[PDB]
Amino acid sequence: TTYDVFLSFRGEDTRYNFTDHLYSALGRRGIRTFRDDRLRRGEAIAPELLKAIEESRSSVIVFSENYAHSRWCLDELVKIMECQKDLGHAVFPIFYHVDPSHVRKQEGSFGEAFAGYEENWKDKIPRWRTALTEAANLSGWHLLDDRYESNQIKEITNSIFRQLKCK
Amino acid sequence: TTYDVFLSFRGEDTRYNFTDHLYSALGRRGIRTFRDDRLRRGEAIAPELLKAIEESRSSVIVFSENYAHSRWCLDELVKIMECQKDLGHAVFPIFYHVDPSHVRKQEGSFGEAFAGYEENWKDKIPRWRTALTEAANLSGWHLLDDRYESNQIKEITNSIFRQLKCKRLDV
């Protein structure tokens, strides 16, 4: 493998702030992290991203309000969960100012997302919901905005350090 | 002195996110920083805070959208600038997603703040306006969004480290 962690996130929500601080915190701890910063286009997710997932020991998912509003994010998650079943791929979900149960049940913003998918992407929805529901039933961290964010990140990155580095 | 840096910020804007990440970054560089996290009440600014500024080698000001909407922030800033004239207090302003000239000239959100001060705090406005205007003419960093924030922070704290270490070595 190439990376200790693959960072899956919604750029529109958290690219330049939370996920960047998280990315940087991971590196300071010697946790090699892939955080996509390339310009990308096309309807289908980039092969380079699917490969990076496969070459990562684990993924960190930054679930944010509009994460499911991105098809690339969802496809990402389907791939990540495949690696979870088939490889030894560890998965650490972060619920960033979103109710974990909304992700599990696709309610709230996540529900609005899938509503938009009904007419043109109906066949991919099943694998998407399943991957979404599976990831969200894993033990992760529910983060609120009422707390010091660097302490939230330190807690997250220490727990990942313990699981990936201490062996 | 007791601290290398006194962190002045508007809690409501940046307490739990940016200023916190800044705070933590400063600590990592061995920059002893005072960042107020106590419960405080009462109309007048806490004496512990004014003392803290006097016992700090410098202040970092996180100017944010609603900074001037807090009299405590403004009274804070006046003290900071006074220590700057009378003591050897260094001052590093960060313009966090706000236009430096809005601060300097009290336009935009900063102008709106002062409108509200007109009726009950008219007499304090002059030294407040002076402290904002002076502080904003110190060389600092204007931070926009759409930029990687941890890098913005690394850049700021690297510069502050070099400047505080050079100040100390020249003395």
Numbering used by the authors:
A (entry chain B): 22 to 188
B (entry chain A): 22 to 192
Paper text:
M. rotundifolia is a wild North American grape species closely related to the cultivated grapevine species Vitis vinifera, and RPV1 confers resistance to the oomycete Plasmopara viticola, the casual agent of downy mildew in cultivated grapevines. The RPV1 gene from M. rotundifolia encodes a TIR-NB-LRR protein that confers resistance to the oomycte pathogen P. viticola. The multi-domain architecture of plant NLRs generally involves a C-terminal leucine-rich repeat (LRR) domain, a central nucleotide-binding (NB) domain and either a coiled-coil (CC) domain or Toll-interleukin receptor (TIR) domain at the N-terminus. Toll-interleukin receptor domains are protein scaffolds that regulate pathogen defense-related pathways in plants and animals through TIR:TIR domain interactions.
Here we report the crystal structure of the TIR domain of RPV1 (residues 20–193; RPV1TIR20-193) at 2.3 Å resolution. Within the asymmetric unit, we observe a dimer that resembles the heterodimer of the TIR domains from Arabidopsis RRS1 and RPS4. This interaction involves the αA and αE helices and the loop regions that precede both helices; we consequently define this protein-protein interface as the AE interface. Analysis of the RPV1TIR structure using the program PISA identified that the AE interface was the largest crystal lattice contact, contributing a combined buried surface area of ∼1340 Å2 (∼670 Å2 from each molecule). Within the AE interface, 17 surface-exposed amino-acids from each RPV1TIR20-193 monomer are buried within the dimer and contribute to the interaction. At the core of the interface, His42 forms an important stacking interaction between the two monomers and hydrogen bonds with Glu170 from the opposing monomer. Hydrogen bonding between Asp41 and Ser171 is also prominent and these equivalent residues were also important in the RPS4TIR:RRS1TIR interaction. Mutations of residues His42 and Asp41 to alanine within the core of the AE interface, were found to abolish and markedly reduce, RPV1TIR1-193-YFP mediated cell death in tobacco. In the case of RPV1TIR20-193, biophysical characterisation suggests that self-association, is absent or very weak in solution. An interesting feature of the cell death induced by RPV1 is that the region that encompasses the TIR domain structure is, itself, sufficient to induce cell death.
